[PDB]
Tab-separated table of C-alpha atoms in Angstrom:
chain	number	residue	atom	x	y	z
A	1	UNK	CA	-90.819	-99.340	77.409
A	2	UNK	CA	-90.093	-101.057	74.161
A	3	UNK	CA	-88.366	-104.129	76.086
A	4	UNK	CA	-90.782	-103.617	79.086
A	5	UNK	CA	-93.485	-106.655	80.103
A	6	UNK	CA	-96.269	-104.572	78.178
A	7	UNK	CA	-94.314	-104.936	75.239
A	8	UNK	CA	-93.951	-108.503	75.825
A	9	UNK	CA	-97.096	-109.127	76.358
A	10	UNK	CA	-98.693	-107.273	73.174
A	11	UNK	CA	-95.459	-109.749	71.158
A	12	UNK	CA	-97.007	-112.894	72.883
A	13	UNK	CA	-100.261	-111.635	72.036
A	14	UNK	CA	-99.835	-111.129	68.230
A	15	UNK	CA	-97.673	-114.469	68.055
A	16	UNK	CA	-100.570	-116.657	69.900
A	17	UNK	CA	-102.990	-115.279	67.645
A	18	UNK	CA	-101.454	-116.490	64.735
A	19	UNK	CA	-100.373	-119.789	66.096
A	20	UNK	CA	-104.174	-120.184	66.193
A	21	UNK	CA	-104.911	-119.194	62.594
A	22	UNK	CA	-102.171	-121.738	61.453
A	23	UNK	CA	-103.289	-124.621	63.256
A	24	UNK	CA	-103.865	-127.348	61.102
A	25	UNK	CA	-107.202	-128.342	60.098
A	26	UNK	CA	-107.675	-132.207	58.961
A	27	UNK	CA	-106.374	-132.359	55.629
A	28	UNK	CA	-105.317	-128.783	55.765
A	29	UNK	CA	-104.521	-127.665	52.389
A	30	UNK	CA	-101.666	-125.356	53.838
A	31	UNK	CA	-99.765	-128.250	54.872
A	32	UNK	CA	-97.648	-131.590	53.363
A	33	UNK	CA	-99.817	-134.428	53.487
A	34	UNK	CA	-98.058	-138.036	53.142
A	35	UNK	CA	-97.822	-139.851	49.688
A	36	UNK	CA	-97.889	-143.438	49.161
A	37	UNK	CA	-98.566	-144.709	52.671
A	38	UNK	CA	-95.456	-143.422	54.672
A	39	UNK	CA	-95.542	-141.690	58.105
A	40	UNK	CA	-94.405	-138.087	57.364
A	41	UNK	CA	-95.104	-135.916	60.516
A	42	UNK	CA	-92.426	-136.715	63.634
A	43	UNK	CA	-95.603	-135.067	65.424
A	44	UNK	CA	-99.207	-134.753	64.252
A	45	UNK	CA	-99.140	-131.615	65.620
A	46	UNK	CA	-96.266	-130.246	64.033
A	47	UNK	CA	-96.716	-130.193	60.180
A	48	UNK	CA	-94.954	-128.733	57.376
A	49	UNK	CA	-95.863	-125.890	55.594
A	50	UNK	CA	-96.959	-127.026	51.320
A	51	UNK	CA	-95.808	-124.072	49.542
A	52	UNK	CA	-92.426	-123.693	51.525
A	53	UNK	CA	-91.768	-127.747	51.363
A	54	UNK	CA	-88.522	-128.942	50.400
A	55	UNK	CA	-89.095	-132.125	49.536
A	56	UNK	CA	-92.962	-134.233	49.161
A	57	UNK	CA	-91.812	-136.781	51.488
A	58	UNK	CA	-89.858	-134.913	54.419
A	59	UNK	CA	-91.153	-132.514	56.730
A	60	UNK	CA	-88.616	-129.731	55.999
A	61	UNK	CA	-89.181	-126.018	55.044
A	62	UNK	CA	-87.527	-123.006	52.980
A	63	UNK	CA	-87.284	-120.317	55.326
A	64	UNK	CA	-86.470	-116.768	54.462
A	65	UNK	CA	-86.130	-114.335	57.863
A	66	UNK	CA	-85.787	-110.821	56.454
A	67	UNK	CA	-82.664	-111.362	54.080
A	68	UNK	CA	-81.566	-114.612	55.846
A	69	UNK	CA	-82.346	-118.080	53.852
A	70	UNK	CA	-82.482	-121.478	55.553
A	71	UNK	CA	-84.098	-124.512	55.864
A	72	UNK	CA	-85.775	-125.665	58.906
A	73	UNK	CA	-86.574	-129.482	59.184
A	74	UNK	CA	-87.708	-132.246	61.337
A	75	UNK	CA	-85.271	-135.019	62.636
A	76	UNK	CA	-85.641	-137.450	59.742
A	77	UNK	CA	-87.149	-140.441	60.072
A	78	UNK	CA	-85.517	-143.837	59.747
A	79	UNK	CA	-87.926	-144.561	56.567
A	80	UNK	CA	-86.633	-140.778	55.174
A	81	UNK	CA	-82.893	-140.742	55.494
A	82	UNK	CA	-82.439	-141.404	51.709
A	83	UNK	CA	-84.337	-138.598	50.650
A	84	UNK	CA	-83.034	-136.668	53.628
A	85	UNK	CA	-79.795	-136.679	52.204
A	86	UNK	CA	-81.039	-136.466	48.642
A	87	UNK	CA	-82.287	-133.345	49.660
A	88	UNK	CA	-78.658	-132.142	51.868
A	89	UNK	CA	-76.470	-132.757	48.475
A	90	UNK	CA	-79.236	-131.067	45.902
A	91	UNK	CA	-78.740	-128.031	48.312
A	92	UNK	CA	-75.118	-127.901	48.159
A	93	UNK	CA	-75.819	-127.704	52.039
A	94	UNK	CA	-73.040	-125.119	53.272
A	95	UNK	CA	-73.597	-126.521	57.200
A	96	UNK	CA	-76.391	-128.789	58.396
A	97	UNK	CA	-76.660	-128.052	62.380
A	98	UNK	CA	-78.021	-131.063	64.545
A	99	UNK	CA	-79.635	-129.183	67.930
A	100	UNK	CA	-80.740	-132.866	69.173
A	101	UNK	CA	-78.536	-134.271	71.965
A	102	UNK	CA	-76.671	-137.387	71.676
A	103	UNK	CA	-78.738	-138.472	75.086
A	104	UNK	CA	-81.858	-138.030	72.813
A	105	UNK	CA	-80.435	-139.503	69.702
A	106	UNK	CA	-79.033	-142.675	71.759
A	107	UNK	CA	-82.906	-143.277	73.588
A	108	UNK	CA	-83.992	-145.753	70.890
A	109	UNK	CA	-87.558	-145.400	71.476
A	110	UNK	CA	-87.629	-141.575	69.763
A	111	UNK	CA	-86.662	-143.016	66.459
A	112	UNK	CA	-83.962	-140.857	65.686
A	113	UNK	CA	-81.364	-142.711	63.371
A	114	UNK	CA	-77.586	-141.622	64.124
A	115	UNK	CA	-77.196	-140.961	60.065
A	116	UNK	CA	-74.398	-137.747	60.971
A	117	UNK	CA	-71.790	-139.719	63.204
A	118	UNK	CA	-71.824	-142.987	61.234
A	119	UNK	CA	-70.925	-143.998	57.754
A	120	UNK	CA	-73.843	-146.131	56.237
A	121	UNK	CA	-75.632	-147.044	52.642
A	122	UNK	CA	-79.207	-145.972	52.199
A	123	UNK	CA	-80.777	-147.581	48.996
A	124	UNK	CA	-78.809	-145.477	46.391
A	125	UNK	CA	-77.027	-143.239	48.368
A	126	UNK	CA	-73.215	-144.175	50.368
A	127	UNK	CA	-72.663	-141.707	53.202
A	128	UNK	CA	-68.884	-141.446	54.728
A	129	UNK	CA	-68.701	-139.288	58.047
A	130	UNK	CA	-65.610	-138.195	59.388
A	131	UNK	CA	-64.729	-136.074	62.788
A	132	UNK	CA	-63.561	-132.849	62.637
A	133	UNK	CA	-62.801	-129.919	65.317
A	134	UNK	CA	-65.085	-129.513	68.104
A	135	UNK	CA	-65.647	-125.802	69.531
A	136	UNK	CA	-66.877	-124.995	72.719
A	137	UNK	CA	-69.687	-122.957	72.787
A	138	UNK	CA	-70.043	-121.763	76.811
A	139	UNK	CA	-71.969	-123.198	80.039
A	140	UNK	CA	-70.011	-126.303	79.104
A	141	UNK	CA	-71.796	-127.020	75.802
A	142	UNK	CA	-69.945	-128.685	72.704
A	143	UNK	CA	-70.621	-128.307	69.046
A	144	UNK	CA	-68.749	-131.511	67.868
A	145	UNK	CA	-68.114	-131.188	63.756
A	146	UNK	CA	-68.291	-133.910	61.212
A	147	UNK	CA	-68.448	-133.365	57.343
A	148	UNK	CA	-70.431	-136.102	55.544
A	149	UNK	CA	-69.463	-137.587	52.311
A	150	UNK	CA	-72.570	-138.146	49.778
A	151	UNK	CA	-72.105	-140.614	46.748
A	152	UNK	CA	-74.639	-141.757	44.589
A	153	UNK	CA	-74.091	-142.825	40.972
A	154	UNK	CA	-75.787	-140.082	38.549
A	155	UNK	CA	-75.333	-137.365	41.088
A	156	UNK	CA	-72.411	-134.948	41.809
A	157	UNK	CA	-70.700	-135.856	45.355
A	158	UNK	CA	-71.111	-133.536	47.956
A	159	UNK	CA	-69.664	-133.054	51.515
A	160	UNK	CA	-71.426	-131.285	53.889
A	161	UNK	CA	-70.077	-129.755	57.310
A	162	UNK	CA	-72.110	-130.698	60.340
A	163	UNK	CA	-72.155	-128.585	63.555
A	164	UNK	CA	-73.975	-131.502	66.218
A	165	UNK	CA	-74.353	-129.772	69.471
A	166	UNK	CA	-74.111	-133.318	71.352
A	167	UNK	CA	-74.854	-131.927	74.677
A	168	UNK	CA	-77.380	-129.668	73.964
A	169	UNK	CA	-79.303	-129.626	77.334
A	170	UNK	CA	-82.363	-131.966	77.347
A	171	UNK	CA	-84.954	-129.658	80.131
A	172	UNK	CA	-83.772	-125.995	79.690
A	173	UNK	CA	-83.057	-123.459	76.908
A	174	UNK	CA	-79.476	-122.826	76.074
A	175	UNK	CA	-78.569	-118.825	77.168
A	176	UNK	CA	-78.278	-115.867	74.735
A	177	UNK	CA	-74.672	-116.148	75.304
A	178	UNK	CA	-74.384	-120.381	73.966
A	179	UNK	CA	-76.907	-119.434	71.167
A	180	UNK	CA	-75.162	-116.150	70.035
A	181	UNK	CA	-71.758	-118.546	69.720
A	182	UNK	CA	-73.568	-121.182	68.011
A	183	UNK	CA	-74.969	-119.137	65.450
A	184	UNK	CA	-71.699	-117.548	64.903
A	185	UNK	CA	-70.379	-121.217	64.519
A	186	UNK	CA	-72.982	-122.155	62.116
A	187	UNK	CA	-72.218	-119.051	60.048
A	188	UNK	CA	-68.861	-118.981	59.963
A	189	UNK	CA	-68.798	-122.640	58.777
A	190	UNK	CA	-71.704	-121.781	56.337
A	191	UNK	CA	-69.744	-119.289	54.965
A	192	UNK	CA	-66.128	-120.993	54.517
A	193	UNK	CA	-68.095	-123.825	52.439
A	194	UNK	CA	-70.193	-121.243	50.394
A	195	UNK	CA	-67.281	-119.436	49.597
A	196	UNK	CA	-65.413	-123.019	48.569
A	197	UNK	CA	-68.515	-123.701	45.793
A	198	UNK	CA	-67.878	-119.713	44.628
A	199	UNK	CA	-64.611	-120.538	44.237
A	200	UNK	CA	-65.440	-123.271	41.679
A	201	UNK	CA	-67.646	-121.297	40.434
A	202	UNK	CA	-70.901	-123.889	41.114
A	203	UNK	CA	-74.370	-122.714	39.377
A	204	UNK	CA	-75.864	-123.395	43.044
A	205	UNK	CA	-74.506	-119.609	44.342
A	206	UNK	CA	-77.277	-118.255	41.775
A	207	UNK	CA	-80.093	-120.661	42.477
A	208	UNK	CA	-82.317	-118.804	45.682
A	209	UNK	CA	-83.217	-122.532	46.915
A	210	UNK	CA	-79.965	-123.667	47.458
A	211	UNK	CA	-76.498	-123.153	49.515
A	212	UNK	CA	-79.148	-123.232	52.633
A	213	UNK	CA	-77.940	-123.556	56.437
A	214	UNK	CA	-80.185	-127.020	57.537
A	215	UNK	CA	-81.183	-126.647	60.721
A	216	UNK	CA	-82.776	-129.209	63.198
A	217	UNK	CA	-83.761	-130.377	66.112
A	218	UNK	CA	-85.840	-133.140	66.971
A	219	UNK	CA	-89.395	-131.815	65.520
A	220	UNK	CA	-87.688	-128.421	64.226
A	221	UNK	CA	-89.818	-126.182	65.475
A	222	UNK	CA	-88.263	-125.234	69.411
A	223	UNK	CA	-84.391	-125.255	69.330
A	224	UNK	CA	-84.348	-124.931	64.919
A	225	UNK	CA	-86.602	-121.601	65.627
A	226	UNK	CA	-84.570	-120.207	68.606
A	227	UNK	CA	-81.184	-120.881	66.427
A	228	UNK	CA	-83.037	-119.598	62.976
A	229	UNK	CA	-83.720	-115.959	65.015
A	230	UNK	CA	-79.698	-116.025	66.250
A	231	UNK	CA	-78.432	-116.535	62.712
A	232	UNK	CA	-81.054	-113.484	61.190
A	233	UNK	CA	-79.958	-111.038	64.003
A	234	UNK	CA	-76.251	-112.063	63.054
A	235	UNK	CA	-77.254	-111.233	59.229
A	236	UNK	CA	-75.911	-107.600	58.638
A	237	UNK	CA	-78.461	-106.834	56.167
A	238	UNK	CA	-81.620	-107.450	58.751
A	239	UNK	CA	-81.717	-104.019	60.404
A	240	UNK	CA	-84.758	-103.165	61.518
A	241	UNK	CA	-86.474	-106.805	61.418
A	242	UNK	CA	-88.637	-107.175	64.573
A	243	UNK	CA	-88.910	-110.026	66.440
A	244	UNK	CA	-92.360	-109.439	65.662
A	245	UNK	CA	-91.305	-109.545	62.160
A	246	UNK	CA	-88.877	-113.037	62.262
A	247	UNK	CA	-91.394	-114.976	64.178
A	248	UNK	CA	-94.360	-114.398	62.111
A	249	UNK	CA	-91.732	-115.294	59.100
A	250	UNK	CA	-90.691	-118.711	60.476
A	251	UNK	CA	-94.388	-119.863	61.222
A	252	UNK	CA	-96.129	-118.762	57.993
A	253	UNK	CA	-93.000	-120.639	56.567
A	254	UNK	CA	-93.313	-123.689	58.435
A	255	UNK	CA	-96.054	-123.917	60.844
A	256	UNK	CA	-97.478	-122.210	63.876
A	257	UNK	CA	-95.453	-123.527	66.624
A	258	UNK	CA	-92.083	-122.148	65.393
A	259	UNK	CA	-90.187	-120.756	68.771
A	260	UNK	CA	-92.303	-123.342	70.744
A	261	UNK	CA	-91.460	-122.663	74.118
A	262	UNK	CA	-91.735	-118.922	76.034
A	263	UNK	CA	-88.320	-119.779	77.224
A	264	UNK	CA	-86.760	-119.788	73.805
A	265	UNK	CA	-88.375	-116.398	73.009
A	266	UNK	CA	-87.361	-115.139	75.999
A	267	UNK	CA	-83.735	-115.324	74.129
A	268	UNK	CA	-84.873	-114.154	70.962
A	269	UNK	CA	-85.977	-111.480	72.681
A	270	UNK	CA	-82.765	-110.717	75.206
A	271	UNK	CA	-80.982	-110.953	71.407
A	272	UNK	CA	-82.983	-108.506	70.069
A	273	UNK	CA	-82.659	-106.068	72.952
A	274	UNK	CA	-78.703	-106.401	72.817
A	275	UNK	CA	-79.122	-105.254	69.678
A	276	UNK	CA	-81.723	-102.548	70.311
A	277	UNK	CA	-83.625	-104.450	67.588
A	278	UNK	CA	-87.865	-103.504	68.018
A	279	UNK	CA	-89.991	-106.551	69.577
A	280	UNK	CA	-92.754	-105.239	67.821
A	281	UNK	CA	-93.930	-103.346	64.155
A	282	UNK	CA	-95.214	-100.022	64.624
């Protein structure tokens, strides 16, 4: 019963009615709205949360799922990329996972700058990226790892491990199996680099806003969500958290649409049951 369709369908009923009450109104004042002239939404539709924003100028959110602490953002936008990676070194950023594909990076006409797998200069900030391992992940997909130097004068240098699933397919949702394997992926390398800053003992491993997974897809709200759910059911100190529970979490912390697509849920949910994790509060 708990897994059954009636279950299913109560979950999808609680989740669609507060989809509705977060839709943004015009000029909500729960969500960013752009500064000095520059396009900040990816989407119109798909808007970041105010009190959860990372950064004024970047559609990007603080995310806490149970115990589990991320950030979910939007593919930056060409005119963003400097603060983008303002905002990746300030957070000591233990992994930053790229869910977009390189087919959908490469179509020039979604705007999606290659700023992971090429070394570039971006006003004040110098970016080196080098190749590292790549780790198959199942059904064929890749997760193809880079770590990305960050200079700028005034600032500490940071590198940050990427995790770029380059294949990711581009008209289906990856299986329970390829997102259980990435999350453990994005964990384990989360947790090698966090434990790297605790070994020089960095202020950052006391500071609740940083040392944050980045997640992202292209408008961070399908793929990002699916992944965020993987990573908080592979959190040991999340028992009991419904899905119920982690999907109400992500959209109150970023917007309404977070887990986008029934399909994605659907994995959430086959997760979940694995787990014999509740769909649903009591």
């Amino acid at each position: 019963s708990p897994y059954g369709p009636e279950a299913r369908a109560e979950l999808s009923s609680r989740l669609t009615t507060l989809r509705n009450t977060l839709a943004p109104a015009t000029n909500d004042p729960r969500y960013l709205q752009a500064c000095g002239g520059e396009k900040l939404n990816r989407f119109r539709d798909i808007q970041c949360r105010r009190q959860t924003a990372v950064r004024a100028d970047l559609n990007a959110n603080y995310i806490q799922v149970g115990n589990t602490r991320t950030i979910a953002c939007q593919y930056p936008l060409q005119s963003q990329l400097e603060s983008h990676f303002r905002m990746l070194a300030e957070n000591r950023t233990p992994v930053l996972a790229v869910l977009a594909s390189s087919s959908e990076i490469a179509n020039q006409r979604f705007g999606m700058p290659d700023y992971f797998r090429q070394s570039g200069t971006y006003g004040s900030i110098t970016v080196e990226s080098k190749m590292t391992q790549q780790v198959g992940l199942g059904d064929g997909i890749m997760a193809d790892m880079y770590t990305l130097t960050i200079r700028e004068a005034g600032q500490k240098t940071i590198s940050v491990p990427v995790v770029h699933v380059g294949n990711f397919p581009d008209q289906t949702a990856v299986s329970s199996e390829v997102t259980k394997a990435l999350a453990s992926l994005v964990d384990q390398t989360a947790e090698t680099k966090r434990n790297m800053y605790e070994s020089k003992g960095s202020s950052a491993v006391a500071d609740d806003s940083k040392l944050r997974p980045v997640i992202h897809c292209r408008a961070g709200v399908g793929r990002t969500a699916q992944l965020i759910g993987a990573m908080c059911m592979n959190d040991s100190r999340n028992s009991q958290l419904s899905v119920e529970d982690m999907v109400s979490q992500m959209r109150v912390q970023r917007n309404g649409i977070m887990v986008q697509k029934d399909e994605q849920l659907d994995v959430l949910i086959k997760l979940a049951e694995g787990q014999g994790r509740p769909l649903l509060n009591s």
